[PDB]
Design a protein around this ligand. Structure first.
Ligand SMILES: *[C@@H]1O[C@H](CO[C@@H]2O[C@@H](C)[C@@H](O)[C@@H](O)[C@@H]2O)[C@@H](O)[C@H](O)[C@H]1NC(C)=O
Ligand SMILES: *[C@@H]1O[C@H](CO)[C@@H](O)[C@H](O)[C@H]1NC(C)=O
Ligand SMILES: *[C@@H]1O[C@H](CO)[C@@H](O)[C@H](O)[C@H]1NC(C)=O
Length: 279
């Protein structure tokens, strides 16, 4: 069978100054929606304190680029507030609705021919953030991926991580023979760069916070610019790695042959870009 495309999108932070992590994740949702991925198969973890924040100059709107579209519109709210935590994130990956404690109960209850795309935005050596402690440590995330692999409930999985030291979540830990490929904004010893901040030329005067993260907006704007049936994960890896080489080293881990897949295997493609063949 062709299977179904599923995704987990998670912004691991809270607070209006962290606008960018929720904007990054809402942008990824818009790409999946335009690609034909269904809401029932997209699990969203976002604190939800940005859109109607008294500090937002545009209530109900979240943008991930100056003059960009409203990426908040229609985004599902599976886990918001303090329901974003290691217990719910790991149970959602595993697909066990009986292990969720608070939230909508939407989980990756996948079948062997399904594809999974996971995107996290919001890091330190060996761990990534949750809105409140405890943070998510490398071993606990990788052990959850090993449990998922042992169930055999997926064809292949692609995991994208936007965080400082992102590569430390997988380096020397992520198995290479279980059809899981991971791409990280930075390697184990590097920080990550924020972008679309106030001060840069032609920036809107209403904002006092950064609208995105450099690696995230580089791969997200690439997804928006091409027919994703003509671009592989490997082609995106090479393009984004070269594009932000001055800021961080884009790194890959796990089952590298999985990146031979076209991005559309995970994300679909927007018909508006059908003529935009990748070169
Ligand atoms: C799915 O999860 C069920 C419930 O797990 C129990 O409750 C959660 C909240 C944790 O406290 C966990 O440690 C408990 O065991 C399990 O009973 C069930 O076996 C799981 N199903 C599968 C197929 O793994
Ligand atoms: C708005 O953002 C501030 C950050 O200063 C946060 O403390 C507050 O809880 C947020 N409020 C709402 C209603 O989202
Ligand atoms: C991580 O990137 C730095 C450059 O920022 C490089 O010097 C270092 O060798 C890299 N580490 C690994 C394990 O590749």
């Amino acid at each position: 069978s062709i299977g179904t495309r599923w995704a987990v999108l998670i912004a691991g932070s809270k607070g209006y100054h962290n606008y960018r992590h929720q904007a990054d994740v809402c942008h990824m949702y818009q790409i999946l929606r335009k690609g034909g991925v269904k809401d029932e198969n997209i699990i969203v973890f976002m604190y939800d304190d940005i859109a109607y924040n008294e500090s937002n100059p545009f209530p109900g709107i979240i943008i991930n680029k100056p003059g960009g579209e409203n990426v908040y519109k229609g985004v599902p709210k599976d886990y918001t507030g303090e329901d974003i935590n290691n217990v719910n994130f790991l149970a959602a990956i595993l697909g066990n609705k009986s292990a969720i404690i608070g939230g909508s109960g939407k989980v990756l209850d996948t079948s062997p021919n399904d594809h999974i795309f996971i995107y996290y935005a919001x890091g330190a050596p060996g761990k990534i953030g949750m809105p409140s402690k405890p943070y998510l440590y490398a071993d606990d995330l990788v052990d959850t991926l090993k449990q998922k692999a042992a169930t055999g409930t997926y064809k292949s999985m692609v995991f994208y991580v936007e965080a400082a030291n992102a590569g430390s979540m997988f380096e020397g830990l992520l198995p290479e023979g279980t059809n899981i490929y991971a791409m990280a904004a930075s390697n184990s010893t590097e920080g990550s760069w924020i972008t679309y901040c106030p001060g840069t030329p032609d920036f809107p005067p209403e904002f006092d916070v950064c609208l995105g993260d450099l690696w995230s907006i580089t791969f997200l704007e690439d997804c928006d610019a091409h027919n994703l049936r003509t671009e592989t994960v490997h082609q995106q890896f090479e393009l984004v790695k070269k594009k932000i080489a001055y800021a961080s080293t884009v790194s890959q881990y796990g089952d590298i042959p999985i990146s031979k897949d076209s991005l559309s295997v995970y994300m679909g493609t927007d018909p508006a870009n059908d003529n935009r063949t990748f070169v």
